[PDB]
UniProtKB/Swiss-Prot annotation, chains A, B, D, F, G, H, I:
InterPro entries listed in its UniProt record: Bact_microcomp_CS, BMC_dom, BMC_shell, CcmK-like_sf, CcmK/CsoS1_BMC
Domain BMC: start-end pairs: 3-87
Effects seen without this gene: Absolutely required for BMC formation; when deleted from an artificial operon (Hoch_5815, Hoch_5812, Hoch_3341, Hoch_5816, Hoch_4425, Hoch_4426, Hoch_5814) being expressed in E.coli, no BMC shells are made.
Official protein name in the record: Bacterial microcompartment protein homohexamer
Source organism per UniProt: Haliangium ochraceum (strain DSM 14365 / JCM 11303 / SMP-2)
Keywords associated with the record: Bacterial microcompartment
Entry superkingdom: Bacteria
Keyword Ion transport: no
Keyword S-adenosyl-L-methionine in record: no
Swiss-Prot record, chain E:
Function: The only hexameric shell protein in this bacterium, it forms the majority of the bacterial microcompartment (BMC) shell. Expression of 5 proteins in E.coli (BMC-H (Hoch_5815), BMC-P (Hoch_5814), and 3 BMC-T (Hoch_5812, Hoch_5816, Hoch_3341)) forms a 40 nm artificial BMC with a molecular mass of 6.5 MDa. There are 60 BMC-H hexamers per BMC. The shell facets are 20-30 Angstroms thick (a single hexamer layer), with 1 of BMC-T trimers protruding to the exterior.
Claim: Oxidoreductase is one of the keywords in the record: no
Keyword Lyase: no
UniProt protein name: Bacterial microcompartment protein homohexamer
Gene3D superfamilies recorded: 3.30.70.1710
Domain BMC per the UniProt entry, residue ranges: 3-87
Coiled-coil ranges from the UniProt annotation: none
Phenotype on disruption: Absolutely required for BMC formation; when deleted from an artificial operon (Hoch_5815, Hoch_5812, Hoch_3341, Hoch_5816, Hoch_4425, Hoch_4426, Hoch_5814) being expressed in E.coli, no BMC shells are made.
Classification via SUPFAM superfamilies: CcmK-like
Biotech relevance: Artificial BMCs can be made in E.coli by expressing (Hoch_5815, Hoch_5812, Hoch_3341, Hoch_5816, Hoch_4425, Hoch_4426, Hoch_5814) or (BMC-H (Hoch_5815), BMC-P (Hoch_5814), and 3 BMC-T (Hoch_5812, Hoch_5816, Hoch_3341)). Cargo proteins can be targeted to this BMC. Artificial BMCs can be made by duplicating this gene with a 16 residue linker between the copies (making an artificial BMC-T). The shell assembles into balls with holes where the pentameric subunit would be, and can be used as a model to study assembly and permeability.
Keywords per UniProt: Bacterial microcompartment
Curated annotation (Swiss-Prot), chains K, L, M, N, O:
SUPFAM superfamilies assigned to the protein according to its UniProt record, in alphabetical order: EutN/CcmL-like
Domain (BMV): residue spans on this chain: 1-83
Origin organism lineage: Bacteria, Pseudomonadati, Myxococcota, Polyangia, Haliangiales
Job description of the protein: Forms vertices in bacterial microcompartment (BMC) shells. Expression of 5 proteins in E.coli (BMC-H (Hoch_5815), BMC-P (Hoch_5814), and 3 BMC-T (Hoch_5812, Hoch_5816, Hoch_3341)) forms 40 nm artificial BMC with a molecular mass of 6.5 MDa. There are 12 BMC-P pentamers per BMC. The shell facets are 20-30 Angstroms thick, with 1 of BMC-T trimers protruding to the exterior.
Keyword Transcription: no
Name recorded for this polypeptide: Bacterial microcompartment shell vertex protein
Subunit-structure text: Homopentamer. The base of the pyramid faces outward.
Main localization of the protein described in the UniProt heading: other
Misc. remarks from the entry: One of 3 BMC-P proteins in this bacteria, the others are Hoch_4425 and Hoch_4426.
Amino acid sequence: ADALGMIEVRGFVGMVEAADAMVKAAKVELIGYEKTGGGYVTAVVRGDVAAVKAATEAGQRAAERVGEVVAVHVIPRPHVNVDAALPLGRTP
Amino acid sequence: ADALGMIEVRGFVGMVEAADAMVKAAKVELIGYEKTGGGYVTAVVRGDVAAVKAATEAGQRAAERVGEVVAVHVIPRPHVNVDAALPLGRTP
Amino acid sequence: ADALGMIEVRGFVGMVEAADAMVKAAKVELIGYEKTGGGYVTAVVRGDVAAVKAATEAGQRAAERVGEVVAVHVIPRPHVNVDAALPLGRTPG
Amino acid sequence: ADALGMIEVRGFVGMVEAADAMVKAAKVELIGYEKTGGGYVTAVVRGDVAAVKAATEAGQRAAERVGEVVAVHVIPRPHVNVDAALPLGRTP
Amino acid sequence: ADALGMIEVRGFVGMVEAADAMVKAAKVELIGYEKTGGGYVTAVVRGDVAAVKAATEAGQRAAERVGEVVAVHVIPRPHVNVDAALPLGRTPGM
Amino acid sequence: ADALGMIEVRGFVGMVEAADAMVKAAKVELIGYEKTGGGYVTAVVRGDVAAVKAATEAGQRAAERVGEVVAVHVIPRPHVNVDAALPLGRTP
Amino acid sequence: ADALGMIEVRGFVGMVEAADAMVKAAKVELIGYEKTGGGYVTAVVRGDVAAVKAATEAGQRAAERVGEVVAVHVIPRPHVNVDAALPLGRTP
Amino acid sequence: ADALGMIEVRGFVGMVEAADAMVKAAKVELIGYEKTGGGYVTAVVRGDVAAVKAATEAGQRAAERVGEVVAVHVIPRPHVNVDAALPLGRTP
Amino acid sequence: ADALGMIEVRGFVGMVEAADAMVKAAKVELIGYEKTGGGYVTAVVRGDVAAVKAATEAGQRAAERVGEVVAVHVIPRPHVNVDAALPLGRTP
Amino acid sequence: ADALGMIEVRGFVGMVEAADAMVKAAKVELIGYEKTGGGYVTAVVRGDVAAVKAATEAGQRAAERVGEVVAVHVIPRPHVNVDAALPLGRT
Amino acid sequence: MVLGKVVGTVVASRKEPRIEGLSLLLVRACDPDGTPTGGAVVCADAVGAGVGEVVLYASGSSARQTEVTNNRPVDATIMAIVDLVEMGGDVRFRK
Amino acid sequence: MVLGKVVGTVVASRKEPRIEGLSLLLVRACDPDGTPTGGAVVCADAVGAGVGEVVLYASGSSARQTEVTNNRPVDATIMAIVDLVEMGGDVRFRK
Amino acid sequence: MVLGKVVGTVVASRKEPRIEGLSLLLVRACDPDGTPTGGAVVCADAVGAGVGEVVLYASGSSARQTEVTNNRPVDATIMAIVDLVEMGGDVRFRK
Amino acid sequence: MVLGKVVGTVVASRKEPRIEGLSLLLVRACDPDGTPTGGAVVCADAVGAGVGEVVLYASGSSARQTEVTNNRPVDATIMAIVDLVEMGGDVRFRK
Amino acid sequence: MVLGKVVGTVVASRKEPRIEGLSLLLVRACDPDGTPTGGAVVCADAVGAGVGEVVLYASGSSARQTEVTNNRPVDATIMAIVDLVEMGGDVRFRK
């Protein structure tokens, strides 16, 4: 259903500031975060496509101030099978 | 046993887009994901051989545009003793 | 609140061509214009996000072909207090 | 929905001579002028497309003699939404 | 008033091909020609503005393939006094 | 209805020899000559397209022996409006 | 009288491929060939003007692929005295 | 129809062996030879295309042992008008 | 019916490890081998296309440890006429 | 007699892809193969003339992509005594 | 290049960036009357055309032989705004 | 490249400037009888074609392999004025 | 470039190696309402399109103007993911 | 590249000189039986095809890649003279 | 690039020599079921396809971006052997 936006930081702080900046930027819903271990954590947002596209590049911009930002990517419409196997707040 | 395709990415966003593009590219069943800690994440896909081989090749190229990619491998016919002892889905 | 796209041009002809090219490129409502004096003129557009952000990008290149272009910016979700206190159209009143 | 022609001069005189030169070149209708403040003013004509096209490049040539000419542009058919929001003498 | 397009060519073949290509390129009325002597010949076309100005641009490029071409010009709104005082076709009482 | 052939010489002689050679070259109908003044005169032939092509380029070669030859051109099918306004002997 | 097209080639094969290609390119009547001895051969073609003029040009380009080609020429309006006095077909 | 194969040699012998080698190479029909005078003679064969193409290019090689080889060509299907006017043994 | 995979080694040993490596790699049916004499031996497998392609170039790796590898190729679907004339175990 | 096309390759993989691609390209009857030892194998095709010449030339390019290829040749009209005395099928 | 009439606009937010900022239009080929008679086809604008206007869009490998479309992936772009259409001497379209 | 009979002309005043001065024409493909049987397509002139003439208009990436049309944006251009069409050996069309 | 809705995926295992890793998708042109109405054509993805998504697939010599498609043999490729389609001021498609 | 049967010849006297000396032919695509089933299309000869022969005419940007017709304006050219067309192992066309 | 089922073979003996050794195949476009539904089109092989196989043949200016075709005169070539075709998640074709 909704699009997908992800920001992955080697520091807990970056993810928060990255998250807050994203929600404040456009009509998107923050769903939670996935700790991959080894420092790295990841914020996950979802919503209509163009807001996320505008959301991420507003978070990365506001999170690069704090520390390193590993990766930033946006999937406009994840395959049906993904949402059913990964914690992306659109599981049935 | 269903074939086996795997992609291991240091980040997390790398796995998802690698996992996704693998699913969007062929008739494959995304089976879950495996966290080895330390940030390393592994996506596991399974299906017909020719399908995985197309999905895998798609994921490698799709995650590298985000970066990282630790290892990428495909097992056509996993031994029964694997599928019974390891979490690759097809475990009775 | 409806999204927001703006173009500020030193001339005036730039704004018009910016205003039009924004409209011809997507489903957007041209809401008016704001004269800040000194020759600087600003077109103000509003609509759904994916439309404005596409129209604006079109207006930028559309004004550049005449020149100038002072500023070009896009706000997806204005806080309620903006739309209420400033002349961007969508003000409840 | 007739065409549109505009000339913008950093001087009141440039606009006037530009206006007269345009009307004399082809059958176009002068709508008025818009003072953007800070010196700059803009002449606005409207009419058939090729007449304006021949009007401006006959006005611009006649205005370059007097002073600077900021910008000159021609819209063959302005979108309906513009005419209703900008003072271009075609408001309903 | 009908527009005006003109092409003046030192040869004669220049005028014809210029005159012709102007007609074949848009809906214009070829109105005649005026010989000023010395070889200089001028084709005169009249019609809607956008048609002549498109035909004109075509004849210029089309006559150059023969060469010469002295002048090429287009008047969108000829004053009433011209068409009345000069043999450019659209002259009253015809 | 037929094509058009023209040769333009700075001398009455060049046109004549150009004319004689043309009729001798192909099935073409000689129509006359149009004196543009200032020396220059012009031969006019008309007929099928391919005949004119072989007629002219047989005159151009045969007229250069006498003197200079200004221009040579071929119209395969003049617009109807021309023949009604120029003396090219297919006039009403 | 029908036009005249001729090709003279030192070989024999040159004539044929030229003679053939002349027929295949337009509506023309291949009328025969005339051997001048010493190996020189001449193909003689006749038909409508625009056909000969196009067919001939095809044989020239087509014979070159073998080589040689001595002469290649096209007469639009042969004098009545020729066709009656020479073995070019159209004789009474 | 019956294609045609031709070899043209500056020596009666060169033509002969080229003919003999051709018949021995593929199912081809030898019809004769045409003396163009001045030494040069021409062998003419006819048959299906690929046999001729494989026949001829076997003669040219087999005639070069003896002497010079003037020309070699293969027409896949001669126009109807050729066979009726030239001695290629398929005349009515 | 099914695809085709072949490995050809200048040594009986190389093929065995090459053979064993292929069956262990994917769902393939080992059918036999054809001794061409002079050392060289040839492994033949058959199965689905991507399985064969993934089997061979996974087997070829296992023969490079032992010795030289003459040739490696994969036919996805042999023409019906082949299987009936060569001993590749799909003969009627 | 139907034409004759032959391809001789050092390997065996060489023959098959050459043999296969020859059949897939035209109306030809793949007639068998002949092992002369030393690894040398020869594929033999027979059929209409125009067909073989396209299959042969097509097979050559397909086997070279594996490598080797010793000889490649096409006989349009084998003498009666050959087809009777040699194992080329049409006997 | 065909007498197309503009019908609408298409908006992409995730697009190949080489084209980003280009204005995408929806055109239907029309007979020389302004009567749209064809299937919807997309092409990028290079002339500032709007909805309801009659245009010519060139297509294929030669639709990139224009700036703002050079090494870009585009197979159809607008290049003209029709002004009148002649047929035998009778105007079939005006502006 | 397809034979065609000209039907009319198209006039654009606002166009990509690389082509200005080019003459835009409207052609309908015709069977070898002069009877037009197709849809109207626009193409530029490089041969001096007029209304009522039977032409061949080449199209696409190879319609620019001609001077006064090289790096210009055009996907259809004229290259000939027909003179006669043979069909099986009997002339079906004459000038 | 034409509107289209993805319908399925195609997988080839024996292919020209220049393309490995390319994602082959199956698209049918759709009317400007989202109702798919056309024939199946294959094209490679460069934007990450999946089943049920509305896309624009460019075709021909200009389907190569993107990395992952350069000197590769491809005559149809995706270049966009549609987001809304306007017609006359009434939206006919959303997402 | 499509099957085709020649039907007749086209002769133009006024052409871009880059094309002079080329031999113009008229072709219709045929079912693999010699049964013409299509519209008449023109293409230049480079192989010496005559009336009644079955040919393949390649078209478009790749119709100029043949020694002749190089930087010439041509979007359709002949490149072969068929001798037989097999279908499933039973010949549908001969010579 | 279009789905296709090989149907037969074409044999030309007089052809442009730059192309000799190329393998000529006859393909009909098929709906994604293996059921051929279209007109016969010719294309060269680059993967060694045989009769009865379902393939993808790309067409046009990008059909030459492959060895044993590059700068040869060919406007359609094969590039794949399909193995399965998904539609909405249900396989319609298998090897």
